[PDB]
């Protein structure tokens, strides 16, 4: 979907067009709403129906009993809901697909070789630390509120 | 050996390879990354820019 344009007008008469995926539509406006007694698939289905998108998600997901969307875009709320349940979203054409983040989820495999059609390969490794990164990164690591009060 | 064909349909007009297309970019992302496109065309007098 076209979202921006640029043009140099006098000598290099060149126009640059920029387009983004349909998830940019869900990231358009901030919302405040509440959901109760709905599974992940149902919530995603309602959100996609609000924009005319299609849904592709095999697993129903867990049942969310009470949560509020507070000053968040629909894409941001979907990101939070899928991340907290171990899911991830992807967009192709018009349809948004939600899948499980598992070590064996890539159904088809494609193998390349360095000796052929490869121009540059840079492999890097780093040590985990809570000093860098975001709060979500250290949440995904061992850091978490293990102790809570009902 | 590459024999590329690139056709872009925007609004109601098409840009073909060898006509006005100068450069083209891509992105096919998963979760953190999205899908985006950035392509540059030659716009004599900026007509399409208009």
């Amino acid at each position: 979907l076209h979202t921006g344009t640029k043009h140099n007008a006098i000598i290099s008469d060149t126009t640059t067009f920029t387009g983004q995926s349909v998830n940019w539509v869900l990231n358009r406006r901030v919302k405040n709403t509440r959901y109760t007694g709905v599974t992940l698939k149902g919530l995603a289905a309602t959100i996609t129906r609000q924009y005319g998108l299609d849904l592709d998600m095999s697993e129903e997901g867990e049942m969310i009993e009470n949560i509020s969307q507070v000053s968040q875009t629909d894409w941001q709320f979907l990101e939070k809901m899928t991340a907290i349940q171990g899911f991830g979203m992807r967009t192709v054409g018009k349809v948004l697909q939600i899948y499980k983040i598992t070590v064996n989820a890539k159904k088809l495999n494609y193998t390349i070789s360095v000796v052929d059609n490869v121009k540059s390969l840079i492999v890097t490794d780093q040590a985990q630390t809570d000093a860098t990164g975001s709060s979500q990164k250290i949440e995904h690591y061992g850091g978490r509120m293990t102790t809570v009060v009902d | 050996m590459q024999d590329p064909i690139i056709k872009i349909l925007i609004g109601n007009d098409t840009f073909l390879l060898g006509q006005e297309i100068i450069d083209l970019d891509f992105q096919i992302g998963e979760g953190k990354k999205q899908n985006n496109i950035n392509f540059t065309i030659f716009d004599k007098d900026g007509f399409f820019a208009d």
Binding site: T3, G4, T18, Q20, S21, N23, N27, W75, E79 | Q27, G29, G31, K32, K33, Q34, N36, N38
Partner: peptide, 24 residues
Amino acid sequence: PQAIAKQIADIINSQWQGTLTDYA
């Protein structure tokens, strides 16, 4: 020198626009 300082600045700006529109 200043020509290239400006070029580099513009490169950085457009590189950042890349990133802005690279992330969901």
